[PDB]
Amino acid sequence: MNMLVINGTPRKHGRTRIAASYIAALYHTDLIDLSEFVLPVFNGEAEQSELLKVQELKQRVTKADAIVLLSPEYHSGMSGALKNALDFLSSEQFKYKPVALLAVAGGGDGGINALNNMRTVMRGVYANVIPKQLVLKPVHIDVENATVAENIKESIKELVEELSMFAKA
Amino acid sequence: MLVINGTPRKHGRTRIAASYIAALYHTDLIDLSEFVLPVFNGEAEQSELLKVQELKQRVTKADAIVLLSPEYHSGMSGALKNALDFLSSEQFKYKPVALLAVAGGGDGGINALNNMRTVMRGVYANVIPKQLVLKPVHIDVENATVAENIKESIKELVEELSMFAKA
Amino acid sequence: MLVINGTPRKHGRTRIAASYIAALYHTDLIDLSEFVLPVFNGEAEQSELLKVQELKQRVTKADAIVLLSPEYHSGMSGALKNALDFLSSEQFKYKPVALLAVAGGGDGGINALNNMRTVMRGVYANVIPKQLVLKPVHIDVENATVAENIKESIKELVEELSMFAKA
Amino acid sequence: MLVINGTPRKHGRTRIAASYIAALYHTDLIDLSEFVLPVFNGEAEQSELLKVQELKQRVTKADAIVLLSPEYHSGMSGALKNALDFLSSEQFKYKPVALLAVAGGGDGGINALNNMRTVMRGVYANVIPKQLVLKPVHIDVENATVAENIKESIKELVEELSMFAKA
Numbered sequence: 014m015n016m017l018v019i020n021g022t023p024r025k026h027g028r029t030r031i032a033a034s035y036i037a038a039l040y041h042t043d044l045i046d047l048s049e050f051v052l053p054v055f056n057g058e059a060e061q062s063e064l065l066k067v068q069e070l071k072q073r074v075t076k077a078d079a080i081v082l083l084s085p086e087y088h089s090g091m092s093g094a095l096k097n098a099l100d101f102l103s104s105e106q107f108k109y110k111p112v113a114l115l116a117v118a119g120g121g122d123g124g125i126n127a128l129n130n131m132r133t134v135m136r137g138v139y140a141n142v143i144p145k146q147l148v149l150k151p152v153h154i155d156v157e158n159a160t161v162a163e164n165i166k167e168s169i170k171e172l173v174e175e176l177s178m179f180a181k182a
Numbered sequence: 183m184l185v186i187n188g189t190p191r192k193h194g195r196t197r198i199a200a201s202y203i204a205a206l207y208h209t210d211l212i213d214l215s216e217f218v219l220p221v222f223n224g225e226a227e228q229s230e231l232l233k234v235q236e237l238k239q240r241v242t243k244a245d246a247i248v249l250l251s252p253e254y255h256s257g258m259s260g261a262l263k264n265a266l267d268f269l270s271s272e273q274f275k276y277k278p279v280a281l282l283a284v285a286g287g288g289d290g291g292i293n294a295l296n297n298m299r300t301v302m303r304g305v306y307a308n309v310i311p312k313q314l315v316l317k318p319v320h321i322d323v324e325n326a327t328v329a330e331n332i333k334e335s336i337k338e339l340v341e342e343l344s345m346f347a348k349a
Numbered sequence: 350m351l352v353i354n355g356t357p358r359k360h361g362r363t364r365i366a367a368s369y370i371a372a373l374y375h376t377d378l379i380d381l382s383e384f385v386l387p388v389f390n391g392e393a394e395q396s397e398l399l400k401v402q403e404l405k406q407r408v409t410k411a412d413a414i415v416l417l418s419p420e421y422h423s424g425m426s427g428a429l430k431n432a433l434d435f436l437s438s439e440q441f442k443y444k445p446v447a448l449l450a451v452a453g454g455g456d457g458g459i460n461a462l463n464n465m466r467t468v469m470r471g472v473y474a475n476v477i478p479k480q481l482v483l484k485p486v487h488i489d490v491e492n493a494t495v496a497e498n499i500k501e502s503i504k505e506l507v508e509e510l511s512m513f514a515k516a
Numbered sequence: 517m518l519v520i521n522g523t524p525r526k527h528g529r530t531r532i533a534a535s536y537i538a539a540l541y542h543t544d545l546i547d548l549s550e551f552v553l554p555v556f557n558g559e560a561e562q563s564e565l566l567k568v569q570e571l572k573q574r575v576t577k578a579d580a581i582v583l584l585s586p587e588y589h590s591g592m593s594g595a596l597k598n599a600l601d602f603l604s605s606e607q608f609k610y611k612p613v614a615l616l617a618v619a620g621g622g623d624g625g626i627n628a629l630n631n632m633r634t635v636m637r638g639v640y641a642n643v644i645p646k647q648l649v650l651k652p653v654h655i656d657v658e659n660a661t662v663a664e665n666i667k668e669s670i671k672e673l674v675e676e677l678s679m680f681a682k683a
């Protein structure tokens with residue numbers, strides 16, 4: 014298609030999971046849901062590299078032409094679950110890969126810290142993070158309807174479109 | 183005082199630095215290379231896990247914490263962040279914390295420190311000014327200890343932490 | 350206690366916030382809106398100027414500092430950073446500091462806070478955990494003061510700052 | 517292509533590095549050590565100033581920018597930030613930008629880079645992945661040029677910048 018969406022929240026009832034679901038559906042992308050895609054904690058031993066899930070993670074990330082990286086803001090940073098998943102990876106999978114960042118925060122001043130955390134880590138693996146970044150609040154998520162609210166759809170639209178533009182370049 | 187090793191690798195350099203500090207100053211030690219937690223999932227039953235309970239108790243008990251982490255991809259280890267996701271200001275509020283990052287070289291270290299500092303402030307911890315970046319040259323793997331060159335810097339770090347803790 | 354207004358704009362919101370704190374908590378006040386310093390150039394003759402001498406002297410004399418800044422382009426004001434460039438850990442070492450940023454809206458505020466935080470610890474200052482982001486809704490321009498909705502948040506900020514100062 | 521020297525010091529190392537790049541790739545050059553601006557105050561009259569109009573014009577016409585800055589107190593120079601405060605996304609939107617920071621050594625460099633990356637993204641610029649930290653060893657002051665050991669890295673940096681600009 015050939016885009017990929019990664020849900021960074023490990024909570025099955027997490028808001029980030031809903032945002033990711035919507036994007037994956039509307040824009041016909043691959044979807045990695047960390048709430049369902051449970052990895053072991055990276056520990057650096059050889060057998061972990063043989064793990065089915067680990068090989069799948071690498072495979073699906075490499076084939077992606079562009080990645081929408083979503084994460085909830087936990088303690089002013091990305092989820093430990095998402096960071097752990099990335100710890101299995103490297104520039105091998107991310108080099109020059111167009112990445113759009115989206116953080117789901119709960120409080121008032123939350124969101125930017127998670128984004129910066131993700132941007133720094135992504136740049137660390139030589140990814141190409143696009144300028145436009147998005148912070149979602151509870152008001153942007155329609156839990157009862159398992160989708161995002163109308164108020165945020167335009168922003169997401171622009172995010173994905175800018176990502177696609179960088180991907181074509 | 184409590185020392186927390188943020189590297190999940192049993193052979194990690196960060197574990198060596200953490201062990202040295204813990205033994206030299208007779209502190210409590212939480213070693214994430216042995217202290218294995220499930221990946222946070224936000225479930226209530228998970229938060230009731232004995233290990234999670236233990237983590238909370240030992241952190242809140244601590245008068246001061248030396249927080250060590252390797253730099254993985256310009257940030258703290260996922261293992262450490264995952265452990266922290268189980269916790270909150272209830273365990274960290276106003277608690278004196280000293281930051282130490284072990285990087286593989288180059289320009290590594292600061293990103294991990296900043297990541298940790300931001301997260302710790304997020305849980306209302308009292309992060310002291312002095313922060314330390316260790317490189318492979320500062321670690322003696324053969325003898326499973328730190329190199330002589332960094333010992334004074336570590337001493338300065340701990341003593342400043344103690345100063346903030348007693349104040 | 351010393352309050353520093355980071356906004357160079359005479360009509361800026363940050364100036365209103367700063368003036369409020371200085372007035373109600375009877376503190377010293379450095380207003381970069383009219384405390385005009387030249388652009389740092391590293392020349393020795395600059396440190397001879399009475400304003401920079403005054404800046405250094407009032408910072409060292411302060412028992413605790415409330416550092417306010419607008420968020421310009423996801424960072425602290427150039428005016429404030431320029432003023433800080435004249436200074437160093439000589440004036441800031443272990444200085445209790447509380448951060449406050451004023452943002453135009455949206456997702457602004459945090460970047461300026463982090464910027465100031467990183468710079469402040471860079472000069473070895475003791476930045477307290479509690480930090481504030483003020484939005485237009487927190488500023489009562491018509492009455493040239495802060496809104497009632499933010500007064501006790503500031504109160505808490507000053508309280509925590511004082512606590513760190515006493516200890 | 518445009519090269520911006522962030523150091524306001526006429527004898528700054530950053531000025532040396534900037535001059536090397538500007539001459540090697542025959543680029544435009546804005547030298548803040550001699551391109552003096554007033555402290556931004558937000559008043560309409562300032563935008564009438566020749567230097568301000570010049571700054572805006574030369575930035576917009578640039579197809580790519582190499583942004584250099586010394587690390588002052590774990591951040592970009594106040595001189596550079598002040599200059600950027602005059603500008604906005606109107607001049608930087610989708611502009612390819614390569615970051616380079618000159619640090620006095622130690623753990624310095626990353627903080628200045630992060631500061632610049634955050635601010636640049638704040639004005640909607642397109643900051644490339646590759647970033648460079650130059651240290652004293654990478655600068656030959658007596659020869660008024662960069663050391664041979666860093667010439668390759670600088671080349672790779674400019675080449676990646678060109679690639680993103682040709683997109």
Ligand SMILES: Cc1cc2nc3c(=O)[nH]c(=O)nc-3n(C[C@H](O)[C@H](O)[C@H](O)COP(=O)(O)O)c2cc1C
Pocket residue numbers: 022023024026027028029030085086087088089090117118119120121122123124224267268304
């Ligand atoms: C462990 C934990 C830490 C959190 N810390 C923050 C925070 O630092 N800032 C914030 O805005 N929200 C914070 N929240 C609230 C989340 O932003 C909120 O749950 C949001 O919906 C994203 O999380 P979710 O995708 O799992 O639902 C935290 C939530 C959890 C579970």
Ligand SMILES: Cc1cc2nc3c(=O)[nH]c(=O)nc-3n(C[C@H](O)[C@H](O)[C@H](O)COP(=O)(O)O)c2cc1C
Pocket residue numbers: 057100101137189190191193194195196197251252253254255256257284285286287288289290291
């Ligand atoms: C997954 C992973 C990512 C790493 N990324 C970085 C990096 O971003 N910057 C760096 O300086 N070193 C990096 N390294 C090297 C580590 O800093 C090095 O292993 C160091 O000894 C600390 O890790 P350790 O405690 O597990 O030994 C990375 C190592 C691993 C295993």
Ligand SMILES: Cc1cc2nc3c(=O)[nH]c(=O)nc-3n(C[C@H](O)[C@H](O)[C@H](O)COP(=O)(O)O)c2cc1C
Pocket residue numbers: 356357358360361362363364418419420421422423424451452453454455456457458558601602638
């Ligand atoms: C040059 C400039 C850049 C600005 N960039 C931002 C921004 O990055 N984020 C934001 O929330 N507000 C931004 N604003 C709006 C200010 O935050 C707003 O004016 C606020 O009141 C603080 O500035 P002040 O103290 O001068 O009033 C910017 C304002 C100016 C003058």
Ligand SMILES: Cc1cc2nc3c(=O)[nH]c(=O)nc-3n(C[C@H](O)[C@H](O)[C@H](O)COP(=O)(O)O)c2cc1C
Pocket residue numbers: 391434435471523524525527528529530531585586587588589590591618619620621622623624625
């Ligand atoms: C006001 C000031 C603050 C400085 N702070 C730092 C620092 O935070 N980290 C660092 O590595 N170097 C710092 N330095 C040293 C500079 O990195 C050094 O002068 C280097 O040559 C770059 O600055 P320059 O372009 O003016 O030469 C500082 C220098 C000055 C003048």
